[PDB]
Design a protein around this ligand. Sequence first.
Ligand SMILES: *[C@@H]1O[C@H](CO)[C@@H](O[C@@H]2O[C@H](CO)[C@@H](O[C@@H]3O[C@H](CO[C@H]4O[C@H](CO)[C@@H](O)[C@H](O[C@H]5O[C@H](CO)[C@@H](O)[C@H](O)[C@@H]5O[C@H]5O[C@H](CO)[C@@H](O)[C@H](O)[C@@H]5O)[C@@H]4O)[C@@H](O)[C@H](O[C@H]4O[C@H](CO)[C@@H](O)[C@H](O)[C@@H]4O[C@H]4O[C@H](CO)[C@@H](O)[C@H](O)[C@@H]4O)[C@@H]3O)[C@H](O)[C@H]2NC(C)=O)[C@H](O)[C@H]1NC(C)=O
Ligand SMILES: NS(=O)(=O)C1(F)CCN(C(=O)N2CC3=C(CN(C(=O)c4cc(OCC5CCOCC5)nc(C5CC5)c4)C3)C2)CC1
Ligand SMILES: [Ca+2]
Ligand SMILES: [Ca+2]
Ligand SMILES: [Cl-]
Ligand SMILES: [K+]
Ligand code: NA
Ligand SMILES: [Zn+2]
Length: 805
Amino acid sequence: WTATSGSCKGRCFELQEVGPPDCRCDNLCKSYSSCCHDFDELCLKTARGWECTKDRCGEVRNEENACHCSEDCLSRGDCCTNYQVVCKGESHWVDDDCEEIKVPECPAGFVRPPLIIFSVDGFRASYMKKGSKVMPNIEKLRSCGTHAPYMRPVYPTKTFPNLYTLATGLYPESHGIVGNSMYDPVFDASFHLRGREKFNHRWWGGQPLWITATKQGVRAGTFFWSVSIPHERRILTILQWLSLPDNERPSVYAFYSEQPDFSGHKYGPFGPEMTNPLREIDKTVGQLMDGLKQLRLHRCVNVIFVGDHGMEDVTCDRTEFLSNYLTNVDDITLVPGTLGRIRAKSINNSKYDPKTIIAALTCKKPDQHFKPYMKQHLPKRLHYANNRRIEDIHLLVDRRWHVARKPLDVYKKCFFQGDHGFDNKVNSMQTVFVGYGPTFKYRTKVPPFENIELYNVMCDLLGLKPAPNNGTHGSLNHLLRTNTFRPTMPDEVSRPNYPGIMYLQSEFDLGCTCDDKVENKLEELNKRLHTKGSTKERHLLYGRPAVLYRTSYDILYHTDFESGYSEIFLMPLWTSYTISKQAEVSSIPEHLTNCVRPDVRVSPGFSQNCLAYKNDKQMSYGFLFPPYLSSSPEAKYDAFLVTNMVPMYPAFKRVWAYFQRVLVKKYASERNGVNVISGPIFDYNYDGLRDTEDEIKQYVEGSSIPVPTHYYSIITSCLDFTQPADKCDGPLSVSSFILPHRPDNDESCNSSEDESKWVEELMKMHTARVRDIEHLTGLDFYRKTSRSYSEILTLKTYLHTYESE
Ligand SMILES: *[C@@H]1O[C@H](CO)[C@@H](O[C@@H]2O[C@H](CO)[C@@H](O[C@@H]3O[C@H](CO[C@H]4O[C@H](CO)[C@@H](O)[C@H](O[C@H]5O[C@H](CO)[C@@H](O)[C@H](O)[C@@H]5O[C@H]5O[C@H](CO)[C@@H](O)[C@H](O)[C@@H]5O)[C@@H]4O)[C@@H](O)[C@H](O[C@H]4O[C@H](CO)[C@@H](O)[C@H](O)[C@@H]4O[C@H]4O[C@H](CO)[C@@H](O)[C@H](O)[C@@H]4O)[C@@H]3O)[C@H](O)[C@H]2NC(C)=O)[C@H](O)[C@H]1NC(C)=O
Ligand SMILES: NS(=O)(=O)C1(F)CCN(C(=O)N2CC3=C(CN(C(=O)c4cc(OCC5CCOCC5)nc(C5CC5)c4)C3)C2)CC1
Ligand SMILES: [Ca+2]
Ligand SMILES: [Ca+2]
Ligand SMILES: [Cl-]
Ligand SMILES: [K+]
Ligand code: NA
Ligand SMILES: [Zn+2]
């Protein structure tokens, strides 16, 4: 109930929202049907349009007009945005040459440069180039300011998840807005685009920028605009708020455009009908910039132009129907479209089995345009699992397709030619970023980055301390002229032990054997030196990783590799080795096929054993440093140490063996050497964070050997590939992955073929940031380089995506 008989006289677009049953006059009142009777008349004036003409110049202030061309308008803060151009001979902001903004040039009483965030729905990255002829204002921002060639959204590449990620710095799993449609079983409530449940605060986790600002005494313009408030009126309201007195005037502002998303759904991303909406967005940008120029704020304000996601070509005929796979299609609820989420239609059905649903959707058709996953098997880079609102069964839908339950859902609801929501690595889903202003750099291109990073920068731009988030603070310091945040490396928590030879062979009863009983003072001092770390500068190029939690571990040196060996998990946390361009692949000799050797530096009680592998019929084992890459026949014995062994399902050893025997050498040839750090990951509760021992759900049978959920590798080399990896003077180049440790290869539909046809493609799917691996292992990499820490942070957030240009 709203007593709508109050008035908006003097309160038009008021900043503090008032409580029912008092009537509202803020930019959201329309959307709650709560505006006062006179809101349209007083607050949404339209008379005479939005531009001065010559004949309006000097006019008598007529308060009915949408904007004013009268003499008092500048001092009232309510001129049309083109007033000075038409009536005072000034030029449009876009026609002025760009001039570096070295310091904020602000009017007296401005405490900090204001921030204006101009967000554009569905603005695909390639629009910057392909639409450049029709967006002169946007192109000036882009070329004069700081820009990325594109910005990576979060998954799913839907609107609300990405707008709220931009607001919070959080993955959707952590902020709670996991799609445009949702069911929360604890609430027993649903969230939709249409309707009222989406306004309830309990959906929205974390701390968005407007609340961060408020709590720390920075005033925020209300970020959200009701759909019917036209764009021109949104701009004028921002400009009016910027004329408020110092103690009332906000420091941060937001404008949101429904375009070009709205048209892109109807016409596809490059439909001829798309030229106009791009023109209109640019015209709005021009109005804002002309308006800031009138207020002498155009070399004072920082302006961000940012998109939520891109747009892809998608039509109704590219729909896969679950009715062509499942017989039981009535006992499921599907959240449909560019992603799929499945749950039971009824929680009273004890006959519902996710296992059989998944199998019925797995590699059933040769061209199948979706792939089912249990949510915990999704590529860890998506960070799309740790929320009760995300259903256990997920479908990753191929770009250009939809998934639906039954054909009747498509025709009883072709309309659309564009959509989005796909895997956030897909080129068509990439979006834009431009930063223009005194605090951003001048004419600078930066590398692509993820939108999770921007909350920290927006906090930096306003002098705010960010709430805890998924950004890596410092990783975008290179966008900014000043206001940089100076991070420091986290402190190592556990220091390693450096064990020498402490145990005799006969003290071990591991059930292992090796054909190694084969025996010289020249090469005896030499192996001694290798076991004390003589080659360590070769194999450990960036310092040892730091262990950021409390644990017990040992550094083990070898001729060809170095490891940090966990006495708690009975395996390495990490294994580091360097493979030069020249290095040779050999095979495992026949006599050493089943060889596993006790490590005389590590007690029997902190060692794995071969008997457990024999008795475990499901579980086999592999090595972290590959025997294939040993530098000499004698060095190869080191690779068979029980301390280099890790548990591996036979299905996964196919993947791993191919990576180690073929791919590492190929990368070394292509990149002119590589340094590899490999190791295990344990994430049984799928939270993206290192498990403690008491979270492990699976051990090798009859033992305390925990089973990893994943294996990682980080593969580093010189960015200037004319320098070899082990003597690189400048910036580095990295690619990494987090491979799921699975007992079958059901994920890979071509897995009955030779590994050359499917393994590398699996690895590409599970590409990862070093930072993802840091969270999952509690390690901190690249501790000792010649590079600045900010550049390292940027490197640690890099994702190798394997898309073309
Ligand atoms: C991305 O960045 C984010 C933000 O930094 C990272 O997420 C943080 O990670 C922390 C570790 O998981 C986590 O810390 C825990 O928080 C508990 C208190 O949390 C409440 O308060 C905060 C602060 O205001 C608030 O933000 C939280 O909001 C969550 O929950 C509501 C829904 O109720 C949502 O609105 C919101 O979206 C958010 O949901 C998300 O997080 C929760 C977990 O909090 C998930 O379950 C959801 O799926 C969703 O993703 C909360 O309101 C605190 O109680 C925890 O302490 C327990 O564990 C410690 C271990 O040290 C132990 O010492 C304690 O005893 C305690 O255990 C007790 O509870 C157990 C569980 O019931 C029980 O089994 C025990 O026996 C004990 O009784 C802990 O400190 C922090 O909350 C989140 N923050 C956010 C915003 O999500 C995230 O990790 C990053 N991602 C990556 C990959 O790096
Ligand atoms: N077809 S589709 O794209 O699948 C579609 F169906 C999706 C729905 N839809 C709409 O019709 N809506 C959607 C929106 C409006 C007006 N809105 C805002 O006003 C707004 C804006 C903002 O900005 C947050 C800023 C944080 C700092 O960084 C910049 C972004 N946040 C938010 C919320 C996160 C807090 C909202 C969203 C109409 C039609 C299109
Ligand atoms: Ca959107
Ligand atoms: Ca975990
Ligand atoms: Cl969705
Ligand atoms: K076995
Ligand atoms: Na298969
Ligand atoms: Zn859309």
